[PDB]
Design a protein around this nucleic acid. Structure first.
Ligand SMILES: [Zn+2]
Ligand SMILES: [Zn+2]
Lengths: 87, 118, 216, 81, 97, 205
RNA sequence: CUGGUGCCAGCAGCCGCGGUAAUUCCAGCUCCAAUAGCGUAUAUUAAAGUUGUUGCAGUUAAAAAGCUCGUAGUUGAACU
RNA sequence: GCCAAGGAUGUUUUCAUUAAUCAAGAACGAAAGUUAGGGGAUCGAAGACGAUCAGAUACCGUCGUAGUCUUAACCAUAAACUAUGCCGACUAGGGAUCGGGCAAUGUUUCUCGACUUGCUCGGCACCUUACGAGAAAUCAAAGUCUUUGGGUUCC
RNA sequence: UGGUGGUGCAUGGCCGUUCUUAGUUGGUGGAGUGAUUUGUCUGCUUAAUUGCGAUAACGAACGAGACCUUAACCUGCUAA
């Protein structure tokens, strides 16, 4: 949020989940974020370059973390032939 | 009831794991080495420790015991763990008992020519 | 002397984590109270109550003094600690430790036009724990803290100057009352407002950014 | 799950569903044309016919009304359109 | 406090069940609420088979047996030890031992 | 996006087929309806090898890009996976736990067994449900070898394999270790690894 | 804090104290809230989300009628 | 055996809002109780005897009244229970089970039936879990309620 | 000032029973809003919470055990 001066005033801006778009609480210990690096031809992944996904504790407890991660990787192009929108 | 105590159990465990290679199954000799290594307060406790130790020696000689380990057993584990036979899951001519997996292989495009059926 | 045992504690001892909000951003569990002490000094605590909860043992009775402590910085951080110990001093210090371990961020907003620093809770936030529900609703500037003395003191330590409170259930149980109020104060960041619609770049995380120092 | 193409369901999924629970409800029956085993005429019969249909030429009972689809007994070939 | 989900007996979709009589005391007990036990016994003792075989005819013919069913009320079953009080967690185990 | 070099590797596909890594159990659990092929007769679910391999490479990439190799925990309560996890921890800088789990390792910061890793790989969620529970408690991502009869609660990456046979366990752990070793460091893709998957198998003996 | 009585005298809105060490009984002292005001009794309001339209509750704390039909009454699928 | 009726299912069958809830108002309403007739084997209120303890007077054993049966008239309640009003929508995983329907170049039987498997609708339920609820026991409803409002009776 | 004048319901020290046997107190974690619970036990065994074993528990301490006295079997190790 911003005041009249236009400067963002708050303790922090909580990270929104990448699957269901929900706020991750400060004590949401079930929520985790995973990182997958970028690989070129013949392995030898490039250091310093990676894409991260945050999965909320509610999703992980419900058991939808695997499917949500599969969907996110398919959208970002890091995974193929495992997640189908048609179902 | 001749059930030993935890002090005797731990004392017996430490002496066997510390002096296994040079230990002797004879009661007089193992009592001797127990006296020379331990700082045991009383002879009665020393004798009970020696008696439990030599019983563990007979038990190990009859069969391996997972409750106690030493350098010889660690070396045996680190030697047997490297055993490897010839390949078993890429051998025996071809895969067997594959009815619908052939259909899934053809659909996937990674079809393997060697297939039996039932 | 404090010796760190967790990786986050070791990083804090090295003084490399920027602020406690960085930890709050990724929800890292806190097991030591020294990290909270270093990142949040001049925390003022209040002892709400001490009660002699007893157990009917075989011969006599096992009595343990239960102490409730609310510790806050009066700037946006509060914590609630309930500890049972044999005496008042050990119970109070224990409850302070739990409060430090349970320090939570409080989001503050404005009743109307955003002028000056935030003064009130942004939206209506509620919390229920054992049939006792506490509802914090925004109040205009200068309206004060219309609450019970316990909840008023909790909100003063929380850093909110204006707020209207509604209470239900058996409020005479102070333990449930403070727990419900703490839940209501802590759930404010859990309400997705239209302000929090921009997507953040999903930062590097302190552990993944500073894992190289985690050697020897 | 948590991402389902409700607008375009799977063809197999629609088949393994009740006639009403589909995205768009519709009949599952069909009208077929039957020729008598010893004649040349045509007759249109319903899959779930409730009454016995009688051929106008020399023929036996065309179909038997069961609980669901009508039983076909004589040696006739049916076309579905 | 509803101790058992069944309320002590298995009955669903019904309003009345014809009652039966106990054995040890012959009390009025509902058909489902009773305890049904099977006692398949032989007509001779285990040690009496030899005596019967020595003193029987028809080329050591097969000795018959008796099948009888016993219905026990709650109090009689507990007293006769065919049914015993179990813990709260162990109450749910409906499988026979 | 995804390079074509990370592919089926037909030879390893045949190895998985011979090791019965697609012959699952009789239940489905719904949560892995997408990971199974058409239902074989007498109620045996066959797992999609292409999807299984894709999840395996994804798991290997997740295990990669970790700055400290020593904060990757491995859990295997069942005796089948003892050899596989020991060889995984020998070839890779990760750590492995076999048999007893001693609940309270990731929590209970006072005990000596406290380690706090960064990522946990689990041989079987059903047999290691304690480890997954503590990982959810202490904010750690989870990769697990899961069958059709496995609960996927608090499991972020799942490898849909048999998870039951010793051949399936050993081959998958060998493939996972080989993939993570080919992703970085050494052991180029063209050159086959000197070690072979039968080393990961656990003998009686 | 000090003298007198000692489950008595008595307080005491409620809990509760009073059977010789009475911080609650009556006398001295000090302090506390208000101040030319303080206290008491009654009627009402807020408390009472214990009259609930906002806004109660009905398995076990008070309460789903033995069941069914059905009139006033209430509510009433989508489309111009 | 006859008569009248009922739900579910199948249906490219017919009308087209004809529906939900009920103050009042009425039908049915266990057992026991009442009025009479017929009938009354066993059990059995009341009662009759004999141990029983100090007293038994009640439990126990035998007999035994009204009653238990039926016909024609009554009433109107019980732990009449799922201690949980009715209608409508949504909400997770599994396996059994009753009725119906669909499919099987599956097994079997002197044209169909029996068994098995899959899908679906309508019921009786069971196990796990708790996103969710509660004061908790517990609950797929007692959930979708301080983020409080789908409609409507009783209390 | 003395009191073998009273108060063991004011107590100190001690002693006798509970208990000639076998449990007790924490901490860090897990469950419950809370009182509380696990740790402190399916099983086997011992006099023993003694031990093996699984084990949301882990790590500890006290006690028991352990320790000390006595009773015989024997050693020419400085003896009377
Ligand atoms: Zn015809
Ligand atoms: Zn009986």
């Amino acid at each position: 949020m911003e005041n009249e001066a236009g400067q963002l005033v708050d303790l922090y801006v909580p990270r929104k989940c990448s699957a269901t778009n929900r706020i991750i609480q400060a004590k949401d210990h079930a929520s985790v974020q995973i990182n997958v690096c970028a690989v070129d031809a013949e392995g030898r992944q490039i250091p310093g370059e990676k894409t991260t996904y945050a999965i909320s504790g509610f999703v992980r407890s419900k058991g939808e973390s695997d499917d949500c991660i599969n969907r996110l990787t398919t959208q970002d192009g890091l995974l193929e032939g495992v997640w189908s929108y048609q179902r | 009831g001749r059930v030993r105590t935890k002090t005797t159990k731990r004392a017996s465990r430490v002496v066997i794991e510390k002096y296994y290679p040079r230990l002797t199954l004879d009661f007089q000799t193992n009592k001797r080495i127990v006296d020379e290594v331990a700082i045991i307060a009383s002879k009665r406790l020393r004798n009970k420790i020696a008696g439990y130790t030599t019983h563990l020696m007979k038990r190990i000689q009859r069969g391996p015991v997972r409750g106690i380990s030493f350098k010889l057993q660690e070396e045996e584990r680190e030697r047997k763990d490297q055993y490897v036979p010839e390949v078993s899951e890429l051998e025996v001519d071809r895969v067997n008992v594959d009815q619908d997996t052939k259909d899934m292989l053809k659909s996937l495009g990674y079809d393997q020519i060697p297939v039996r059926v039932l | 002397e404090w010796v760190p045992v967790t990786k986050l504690g070791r990083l804090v001892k090295a003084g490399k984590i920027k602020s406690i909000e960085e930890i709050y951003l990724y929800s890292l569990p806190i097991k030591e109270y020294q990290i909270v002490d270093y990142f949040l000094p001049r925390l003022n605590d209040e002892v709400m109550k001490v009660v002699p909860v007893q157990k009917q043992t075989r011969a006599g009775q096992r009595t343990r003094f239960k102490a409730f402590v609310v510790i806050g910085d009066s700037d946006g951080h509060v914590g609630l600690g309930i500890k049972c110990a044999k005496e008042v001093a050990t119970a109070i210090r224990g409850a302070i430790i739990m409060g430090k371990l349970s320090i939570m961020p409080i989001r503050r907003g404005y009743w109307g036009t955003a002028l000056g620093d935030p003064h009130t809770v942004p939206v209506k936030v509620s919390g229920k724990c054992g049939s006792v529900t506490v509802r914090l609703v925004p109040a205009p500037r200068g309206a004060g803290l219309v609450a019970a003395p316990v909840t008023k003191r909790f909100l003063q330590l929380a850093g909110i100057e204006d707020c209207y409170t509604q209470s239900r259930g058996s409020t005479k149980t102070l333990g449930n009352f403070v727990k419900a109020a703490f839940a209501a104060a802590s759930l404010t960041y859990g309400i997705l407002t239209p302000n929090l619609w921009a997507e953040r770049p999903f930062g590097q995380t302190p552990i993944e950014e500073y894992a190289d120092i985690l050697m020897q | 799950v948590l991402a389902v193409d409700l607008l375009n369901p799977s063809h197999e999924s629609e088949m393994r569903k009740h006639k009403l629970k589909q995205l768009v409800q519709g009949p599952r029956s069909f009208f077929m044309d039957v020729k008598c085993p010893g004649c040349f005429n045509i007759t249109t019969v319903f899959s779930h016919a409730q009454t016995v249909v009688i051929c106008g030429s020399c023929a036996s009972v065309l179909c038997q009304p069961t609980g669901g689809k009508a039983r076909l007994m004589e040696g006739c070939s049916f076309r579905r359109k | 406090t509803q101790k058992r989900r069944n309320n002590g007996r298995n009955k669903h979709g019904r309003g009345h069940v014809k009652f039966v009589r106990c054995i040890n005391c012959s009390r009025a007990v509902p058909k489902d609420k009773a305890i049904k036990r099977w006692t398949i016994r032989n007509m001779v003792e285990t040690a009496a088979i030899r005596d019967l075989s020595e003193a029987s005819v028809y080329s050591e013919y097969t000795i018959p047996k008796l099948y009888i069913k016993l219905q026990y009320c709650v109090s009689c079953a507990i007293h006769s030890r065919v049914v015993r009080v179990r813990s709260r967690e162990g109450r749910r185990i409906r499988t026979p031992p | 996006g995804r390079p074509n070099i990370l592919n089926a590797t037909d030879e390893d596909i045949k190895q998985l087929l011979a090791a019965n890594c697609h012959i699952g159990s009789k239940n489905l659990e719904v949560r892995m309806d997408n990971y199974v092929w058409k239902r074989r007769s007498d109620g045996v679910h066959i797992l999609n090898l292409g999807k299984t391999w894709e999840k395996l490479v994804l798991a290997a990439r997740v295990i990669a890009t970790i700055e400290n190799p020593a904060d990757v925990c491995v859990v295997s309560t069942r005796t089948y996976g003892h050899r596989a996890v020991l060889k995984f921890a020998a070839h890779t800088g990760a750590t492995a736990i076999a048999g007893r789990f001693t609940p309270g390792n990731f929590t209970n910061y006072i005990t000596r067994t406290y380690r706090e890793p960064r990522l946990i790989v689990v041989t079987d969620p059903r047999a290691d449900a304690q480890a997954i529970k503590e990982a959810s408690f202490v904010n750690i991502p989870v990769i697990a070898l899961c069958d059709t009869d496995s609960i996927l609660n608090h499991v972020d990456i799942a490898i849909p394999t048999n998870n039951k046979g010793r051949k399936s366990i050993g081959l998958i752990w060998y493939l996972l270790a080989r993939e993570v070793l080919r992703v970085r460091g050494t052991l180029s893709r063209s050159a086959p690894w000197d070690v072979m998957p039968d080393l990961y198998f656990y003998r009686d003996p």
